């Protein structure tokens, strides 16, 4: 009973690190868009004054 | 798409009775060979070519050979309720029994008979078109079932090879067992069985025993009852090629989903609902709990605990009203389940066939009536405890020389019992790494 | 003048078949003994596109059935609308696959693939103006796959300049029905992608998901599956069969869908679905309809159509509608979320209209997006293909019949280029 | 043997509880930015229609 | 054009606003069947704002029902005018919040809130010109307060600036049903006052005592209250649906009856709510509509004006009537009564007249005043609830709920803060 609660827990936990690292890919991703069209909404705004 | 059957040794020749019990009634015919000329059960001309193959005006003639060397119980089956249905030269009876002797099976009596059967085998395919392959039932547990069992199944590999081989062994039980020098004959049966038999279904006498006294509550089985549900696992694994379902797979399927490694095939087997006559309306019964049934090791047909063992592939035949779509929810909380465990070199391990057909029950049964049924038979890694405890029973008789010059004398050297012992190990050995 | 020639390989391919012929007979008003009772004198004009007439009234559909076992052939010919198609188009033989894309490439179709060109070829030089092919298989099978894939090459040296539909049934995660599905699956796509003109990806997890969610039904079975996807597919086959103020046939959708040449898979949807107690409740109108078409739960992949981008859409109104209302809302729902469409292409999204309206309906829509968000099945299968051939699993049965690992080797890599080419358009 | 066994497992569970509650949050902060990037979208598409 | 959308929390809010439903589908002249079957024209120019066309002329209702329990649904679809509604609004989950405030705004918000919202997302871009919503409630319960209040808070943070009614009956200490109120009563009002744009208070206490001496019923059931409360509802938004000599829209009531945003309670009334004995003996006059309105016995509150002091009041009156004789009454309660109505806002009533009446009366008209005397229901509600918390009783099934004293006590402090403005202003 123990070696297949181990085993199960052992595969859980790499699938769910497996996505963790994709959020972590997915959130430097999104900051790196926000900053670019954060700048290109001011670029956008100084055209308007 | 039909298959032919042989049955050899005296377990053998019972389930093939329970076996012809089944199947004449299932299809409708009467049994002495004629079909009913009033009622029409069910229908489908082709459904039963499967194993019923018809002679001339109306008469139909299985496609078996029920093969023994002792003439007791082959004359049991000749004068019984089934003269006219069988054919008078596929009753194969020799003169004297192999009386458990391995070599004696082997050498010295199944010389002279295999030729003989194979005359009636050639001649059974000769007669049939779409042949799909073999079916054997024996138990290894002896002298016939290891020794003229292992002789014609390598004897039939050389000549057809090409055709699968489906067996269905009853090996020695874990403690509950009859013959006292079964743990020779079971290594000298197996070591040509792993490589020459296709697909191998272990069964055991305890555990049908165990299932008998905890579900159909006869706390006083029998070898009827016993060889009355094999023979219906055997026509809930075979009802595909009869009887038309939506996912419906064959031998061939049946044999390339399952065996990943070409040694690889050693497999459990379990059926699904084994309810008493009075229980059969009682307990709700649908495709979730049944199938919850079916893998409960209270309820698996030879006695090893699956969770001792990853499993590496399943299959679970369906039969009668079964949508398709609650078989995939089930099967989602089957994977969902934590005490039964997959291995990580196998991610998808569910072939999942359907059939629209309810199943029999033969008349003053055990088994009751039931909308739906489901055969599980899997691949698994538990079977290298059986085969470890097996090892350890032969360790004691061989060092001790036991029992050694009923062999010696009749033609076996110690050699066999050597290498025998030497690939059950390595066959061990496998599953320990495949496991790993 | 144009025709279409109609393909079914697999268990899965014959009964989809089957339900899309039963769908386009009851549609063009034929019964299924095939004889002609429709009503309108504007379904006769087109008949010709799909239908034969042969000496007698009986107009035999133009579709060749293949497979390994005259099974599928017995419930076909068995059930409705079976007694129209063609003894010549029951071309099969009586050994069997059996899931292995091996016996299904080279054992039998080797020598069943003379067969099915035989008549595949008498009914394309029987038709004159001939458009194109469309072939319905599933891929994870082993006559629709392997056997469907062989006929797919064969079929596409022979006609160079005729395009082909291909409405492929992919592995799914959730409904495992078979064990080794992703060794045919990526062998049958490695095969496709080079041979594929457009390949609509179907799964059933995806329809199962429709049919409990939005048709909010009890019992979904096949004879449900196969009815959403004939929908599908008489949706697609539109335009050319019925005339409307802006037709838009195959090769159009083929030019508007396609903006590099392995950039094929479309996830496809029909509109509108709605639950059979509450069918008189909302009104048939045509933002509805578009909002009912840029919908996830309404797609038929299991691919998430918001985890990625659109690169194009394509749009098959059938009904009679007003234009600008159909591109105003086109241009809203694009203008509305700009994050989930191409940057570096204006106008995504084309929107044709035919001009009869399916029966039963008063319009219709059916929707195919060709998404850069597809990649992730192709990324479920290849690392299912990683986790069993990193121990050659089942491997013998595919070595010992006409196989090698140099083929296994080269489909992973080719799996891997191809998520990645869709992944850096992102 | 048994005893240790179940004892990292049990530190093996505690473990993925923590790493999955982080994975939550991580999702949550995901949907945000979502919105933020949408938001951000819209409102530069405005600021182009001026 | 304008657009109400109607949401009913919790069973008393689902039963209220199903005999609204009734109500209003009565006055627009459709049969339970939604089909149309009135004679008047002027019944078919204003549907739009509360009801949704379909095809085929059937009107289904703008409304979404929100709960926890199937009972209430089956009960809801069980009852006439019920199919009315449209089955894709019928959202509820499957345990119930057992009145535990904390679980319905903690623990079964999160699973039925992401598609409360959803629906009633649909359905507020169904339309155009968003006038606001409509929740009807009780702040008593668990899931009729829990919920109900974040879905207003939920709807506050999505639509900024459009105007939310909350109907919502208040408990009593005569009436309470149950041993948790003030909990659930404190913890509503305290977000009650940053959410809702208007709430006006109802009360089973003075909704029986008028049972009781108005109509002098015997058996007064629930269905006789949630008639007064649909009656008081559909009268209060007569000038959207129906032409008026005087209009008198959302906006314009609130902006006119709230002069400070922390003073949006209000008390409403009913005229003429009379007898069926006694009205025959009676001629209806606008002085005697004044004069039932003014007097406590009928105000629909238990709250009694002559305890304090008037901010403002309005009168919808409904009635081919004369405007002299309308300003006239209204000045003349005025004068009559120089101290109840505040000093410092000179006239502080105001007055609105629309044409068609309710159906069988000639003349009607509702009220609505923002009295200060409301200030003692909050005041022993606070009182109660001090009682209760005092030693923490109750308390573990919301403290193992996730709510902390700290909660509470602002809670409380909130209601001690509210009172004191009304005190401050009085
Ligand atoms: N389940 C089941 N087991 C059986 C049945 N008949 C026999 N067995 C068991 O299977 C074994 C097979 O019988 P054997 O001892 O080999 O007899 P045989 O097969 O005729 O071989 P020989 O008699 O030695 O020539 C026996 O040891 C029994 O324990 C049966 O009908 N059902
Ligand atoms: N959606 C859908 N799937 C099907 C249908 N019939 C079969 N399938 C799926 O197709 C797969 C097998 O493909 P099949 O057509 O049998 O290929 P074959 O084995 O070579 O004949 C199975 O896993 C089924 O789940 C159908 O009617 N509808
Ligand atoms: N008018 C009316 N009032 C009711 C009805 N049922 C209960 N009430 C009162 O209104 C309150 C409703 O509470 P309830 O809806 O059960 O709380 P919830 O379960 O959280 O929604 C109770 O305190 C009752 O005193 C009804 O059918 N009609
Ligand atoms: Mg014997």
């Known amino acids: 009973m123990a070696e297949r609660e181990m085993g199960r827990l052992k595969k859980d936990i790499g699938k769910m690190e497996a996505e963790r690292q994709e959020l972590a890919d997915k959130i430097n991703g999104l900051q790196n868009q926000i900053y670019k069209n954060n700048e290109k909404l001011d670029q956008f705004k100084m055209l308007m004054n | ?436 | 003048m144009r025709e279409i020639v109609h393909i079914q390989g697999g268990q899965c391919g014959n009964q989809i078949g089957a339900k899309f012929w039963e769908v386009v007979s009851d549609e063009h008003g034929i019964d299924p003994t095939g004889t002609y009772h429709g009503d309108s004198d504007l379904q006769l004009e087109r008949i010709n596109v799909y239908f034969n007439e042969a000496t007698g009234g009986r107009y035999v559909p133009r579709a060749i059935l293949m497979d390994l076992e005259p099974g599928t052939m017995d419930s076909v010919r068995s059930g409705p609308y079976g007694q129209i198609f063609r003894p010549d188009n029951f071309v099969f033989g009586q050994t069997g696959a059996g899931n292995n894309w091996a016996k299904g490439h080279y054992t039998e179709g080797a020598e069943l693939i003379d067969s099915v060109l035989d008549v595949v070829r008498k009914e394309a030089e029987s038709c004159d103006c001939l458009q194109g092919f469309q072939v319905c298989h599933s891929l994870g099978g082993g006559t629709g796959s392997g056997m469907g894939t062989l006929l797919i090459s064969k079929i596409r040296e022979e006609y160079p300049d005729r395009m082909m539909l291909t409405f492929s049934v992919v592995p799914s995660p959730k409904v495992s029905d078979t064990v080794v599905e992703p060794y045919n699956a990526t062998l049958s796509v490695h095969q496709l992608v080079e041979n594929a003109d457009e390949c609509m990806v179907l799964d059933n997890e995806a329809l199962y998901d429709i049919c409990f969610r939005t048709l909010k039904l009890t019992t979904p079975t096949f004879g449900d599956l196969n009815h959403l996807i004939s929908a599908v597919m008489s949706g697609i086959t539109c335009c050319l069969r019925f005339p409307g103020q802006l037709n838009a046939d195959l090769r159009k959708l083929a030019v508007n869908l396609i903006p590099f040449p392995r950039l094929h898979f479309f996830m496809v949807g029909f509109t509108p679905l709605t639950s059979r107690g509450s069918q008189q409740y909302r009104a048939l109108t045509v933002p509805e309809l578009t909002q009912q078409m840029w919908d996830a739960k309404n797609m038929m992949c299991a691919a998430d159509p918001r985890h990625g981008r659109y690169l194009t859409a394509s749009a098959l109104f059938r009904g009679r509608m007003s234009t600008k209302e159909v591109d105003e809302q086109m241009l809203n729902v694009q203008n509305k979320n700009s994050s989930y469409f191409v940057e570096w292409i204006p106008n995504n999204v084309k929107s044709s209209v035919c001009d009869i309206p399916p029966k039963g309906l008063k319009m219709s829509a059916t929707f195919i997006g060709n998404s850069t968000a597809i990649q992730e099945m192709f990324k479920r299968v290849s690392e299912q293909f990683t986790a069993m051939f990193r121990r050659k699993a089942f491997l013998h049965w595919y070595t010992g019949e006409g196989m090698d690992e140099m083929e296994f080797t080269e489909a992973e890599s080719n799996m891997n280029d191809l998520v990645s080419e869709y992944q850096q358009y992102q | 043997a048994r005893q240790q066994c179940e004892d990292q497992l049990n530190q093996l569970k505690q473990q993925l509880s923590l790493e999955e509650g982080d994975t939550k949050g991580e999702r949550s902060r995901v949907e945000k930015f979502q919105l933020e990037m949408d938001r951000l979208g819209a409102t530069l598409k405005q600021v182009e229609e001026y």
């Open chain 2, 1 to 436: 798409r039909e298959v032919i059957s042989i049955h050899i040794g005296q377990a053998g020749i019972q389930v093939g009775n329970a076996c012809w019990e089944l199947y004449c009634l299932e299809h409708g015919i009467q049994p002495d060979g004629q079909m009913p000329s009033d009622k029409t059960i069910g229908g489908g001309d082709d459904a039963f070519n499967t194993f019923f193959s018809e002679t001339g005006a109306g008469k139909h003639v299985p496609r078996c050979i029920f093969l023994d060397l002792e003439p007791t119980v082959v004359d049991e089956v000749r004068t019984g309720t089934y003269r006219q249905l069988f054919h008078p030269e596929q009753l194969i009876s020799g003169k004297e029994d192999a009386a458990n002797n391995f070599a004696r099976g082997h050498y010295t009596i199944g010389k002279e008979i295999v030729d003989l059967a194979l005359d009636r085998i050639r001649k059974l395919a000769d007669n049939c078109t779409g042949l799909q392959g073999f079916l054997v039932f024996n138990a290894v547990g002896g002298g016939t079932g290891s020794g003229l069992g292992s002789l014609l199944l390598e004897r039939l590999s050389v000549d057809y090879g090409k055709k699968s081989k489906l067996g269905f062994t009853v090996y020695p039980s874990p403690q509950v067992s009859t013959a006292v020098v079964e743990p020779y004959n079971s290594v000298l049966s197996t070591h040509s069985l792993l490589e020459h038999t296709d697909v191998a279904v272990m069964l055991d006498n305890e555990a049908i025993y165990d299932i008998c006294r905890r579900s159909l509550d006869i706390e006083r089985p029998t070898y009827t009852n016993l060889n009355r549900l094999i023979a219906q696992v055997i026509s809930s694994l075979t009802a595909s090629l009869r009887f038309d379902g939506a996912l419906n797979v064959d031998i061939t399927e049946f044999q390339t989903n399952l065996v990943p490694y070409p040694r690889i095939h050693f497999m459990l087997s379990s059926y699904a609902p084994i309810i008493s006559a009075e229980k059969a309306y009682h307990e709700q019964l649908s495709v979730a709990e049944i199938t919850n049934a079916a893998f409960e090791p209270a309820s698996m047909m030879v006695k090893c605990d699956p969770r001792h063992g990853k499993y590496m592939a399943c299959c679970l035949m369906y039969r009668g009203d079964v949508v398709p779509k609650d078989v995939n929810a089930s099967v989602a909380t089957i994977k969902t389940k934590r005490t039964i465990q997959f291995v990580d070199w196998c991610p998808t391990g569910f072939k999942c066939g359907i059939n629209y057909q309810p199943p029999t029950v033969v008349p003053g049964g055990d088994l009751a009536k039931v909308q739906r049924a489901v055969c599980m038979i899997s691949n698994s890694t538990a079977i290298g405890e059986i085969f470890s405890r097996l090892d350890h029973k032969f360790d004691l008789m061989y060092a001790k020389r036991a029992f050694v010059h009923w062999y010696v004398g009749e033609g076996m050297e110690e050699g066999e019992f050597s290498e025998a012992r030497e690939d059950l190990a390595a066959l061990e050995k496998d599953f320990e790494e495949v496991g790993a």
